[PDB]
């Protein structure tokens, strides 16, 4: 087989899962979050995926 | 066979899940957020997939 | 088989499920949310997929 | 077989899971938090995959 | 078999599974997180894959 | 002061929630329940405050 | 002060929450519960506070 | 002071959470539940407070 | 001071939180459950306060 | 001061925390489950307060 790619690809064969992302947020994931109380100016309480970059 | 992408691709078979994105958001997971009180100012307090490039 | 693609593709065969996106938001999976109160100004309070580029 | 890629490319085959990122942030695992009281100004309670690059 | 990359590539046979970043942060992992209390200014308490790089 | 219950009571001041029961069901909370697909013969689905006293 | 109960009481002051039950159910408290697929018979999939007296 | 129960009582001041049961479930905490799948027969997936006499 | 009590009783002071149970079920603080597959007949997945007293 | 019980009683001063069981179960604490696959017939994956008298 042959293949020419510039990116971002993703290629497969026989594949459970896939994810292709430029950006930007994706979430495919089981994800429970219990939470009581937030407070303070400002802290991040719960983060599983993040991305900060303030100008 | 023969592939040639540009960008951004996502090429597969017998794929149970499937995502391509650029942006943005995608949500296609199973996800539980149960929250009792949120303050402050300002706090991120329950971020899955989260992406933050204020100028 | 031949596939040239300039992106954003997704091609597939015997595929559960598929997401395309460029912009843009899509939500397709199963979210609960349960939230009692959210104060402070201003807070993200529960957030899954998310992309914040304010200018 | 013959591949030439400008990246982020991820080729695989018979492959269980995939994730390509720029960006960005991609959730696809399992992920439980459970939290009773968060405080102070401003501690990254609970993170996981994270990244801050403030300017 | 013959490849060139310009990276980041990854490249690869019979592969359970596979990630590509360039940013960012990506979350695949089962991950759980229980806590009681937080509190200080500002204090990292539980980060698993972490980058901060303040200027 | 002084008080003589014979049950069941629930006596207080400067109080912001109070429930009483004998039965019975009383539901005051937030709760937030997504479900996709519910099969099984019979399966208790996402029971929050439950009792079965089947004779 | 004085006081006598014959059960089940619940007797306080400068209290936030109160709860009374003889059954019996009494939800008050925060609850999410985003769920996907429920199979078999019969699997009690998520309960949170449940009670079975079956005869 | 002087106070006599018969039970079950609960007696306090200052006091800023109660709960007395008999039966019976009382739920009055935060609680997150994300499921995706359940199967089998028959299974107790995810039981947080529980409680089985079956005759 | 004076207390006679049968049981069950909970007597106290300046006191954050009470539990009193006959049972039963109570649950009161903070739980946070994900979770992706369940099989098995029958296999208790995840239990946090649990009786099987099946007879 | 003078105290009779038959038990169960919990009798205390200045307490933060109080739990009274005769039973049955009482979840009062911070409790965090992530969880992947469960199989087998039957395993008890992940428990932790747990009586089982089966007879
Ligand atoms: C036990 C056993 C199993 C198999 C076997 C099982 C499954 C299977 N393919 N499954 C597929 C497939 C596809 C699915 C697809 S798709 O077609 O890709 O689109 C989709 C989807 S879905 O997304 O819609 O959910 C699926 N769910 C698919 C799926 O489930 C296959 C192929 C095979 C095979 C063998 C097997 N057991 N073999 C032996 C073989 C020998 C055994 C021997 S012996 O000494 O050799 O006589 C003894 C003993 S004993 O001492 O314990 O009794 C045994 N137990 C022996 C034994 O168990
Ligand atoms: C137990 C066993 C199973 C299979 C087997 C099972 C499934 C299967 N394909 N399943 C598919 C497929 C497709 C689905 C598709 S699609 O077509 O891709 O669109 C879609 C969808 S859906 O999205 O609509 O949900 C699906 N659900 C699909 C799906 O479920 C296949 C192919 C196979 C095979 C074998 C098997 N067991 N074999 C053996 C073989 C031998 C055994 C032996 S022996 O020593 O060899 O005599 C002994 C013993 S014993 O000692 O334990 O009694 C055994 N148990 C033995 C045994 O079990
Ligand atoms: C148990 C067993 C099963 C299969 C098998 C099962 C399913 C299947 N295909 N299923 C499909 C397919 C398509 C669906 C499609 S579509 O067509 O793609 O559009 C759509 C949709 S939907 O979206 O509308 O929901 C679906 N639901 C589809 C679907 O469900 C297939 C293909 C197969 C096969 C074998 C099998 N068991 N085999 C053996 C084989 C041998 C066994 C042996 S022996 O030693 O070899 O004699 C012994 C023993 S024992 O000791 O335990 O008694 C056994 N149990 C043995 C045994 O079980
Ligand atoms: C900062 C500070 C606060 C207080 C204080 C605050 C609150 C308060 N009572 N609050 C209530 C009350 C009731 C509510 C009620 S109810 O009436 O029960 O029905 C209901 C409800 S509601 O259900 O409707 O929401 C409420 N929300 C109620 C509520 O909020 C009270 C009583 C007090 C007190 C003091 C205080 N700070 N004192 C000092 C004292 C000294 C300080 C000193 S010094 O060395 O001693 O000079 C220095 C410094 S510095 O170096 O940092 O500048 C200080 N910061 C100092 C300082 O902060
Ligand atoms: C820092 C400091 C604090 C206090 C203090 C703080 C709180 C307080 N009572 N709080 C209550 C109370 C009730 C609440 C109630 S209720 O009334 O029970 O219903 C309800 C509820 S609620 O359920 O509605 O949420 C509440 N939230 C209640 C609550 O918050 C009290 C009583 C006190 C006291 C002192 C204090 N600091 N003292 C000193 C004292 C000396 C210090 C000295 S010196 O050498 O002695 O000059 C030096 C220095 S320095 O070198 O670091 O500058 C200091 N920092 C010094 C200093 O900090
Ligand atoms: C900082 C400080 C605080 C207090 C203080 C704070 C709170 C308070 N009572 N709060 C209540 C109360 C009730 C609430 C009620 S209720 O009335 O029970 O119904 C209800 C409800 S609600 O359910 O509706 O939400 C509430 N929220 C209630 C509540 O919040 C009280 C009583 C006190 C007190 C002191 C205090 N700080 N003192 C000092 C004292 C000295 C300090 C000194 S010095 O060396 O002694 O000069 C130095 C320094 S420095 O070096 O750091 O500048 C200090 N910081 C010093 C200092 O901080």
């Given at each position: 087989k042959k293949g020419?790619?510039?990116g971002?690809?993703?290629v497969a064969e026989k594949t459970?899962?896939?994810v292709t992302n430029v950006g930007g947020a994706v979430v495919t994931?089981?994800?429970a979050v219990a939470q009581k109380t937030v407070?303070?100016?400002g802290?991040?309480?719960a983060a599983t995926g993040?991305?900060?970059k303030d100008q």
């Open positions: 020419v790619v510039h971002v690809a993703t459970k899962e896939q994931g089981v994800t407070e303070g100016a802290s991040i309480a993040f991305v900060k």
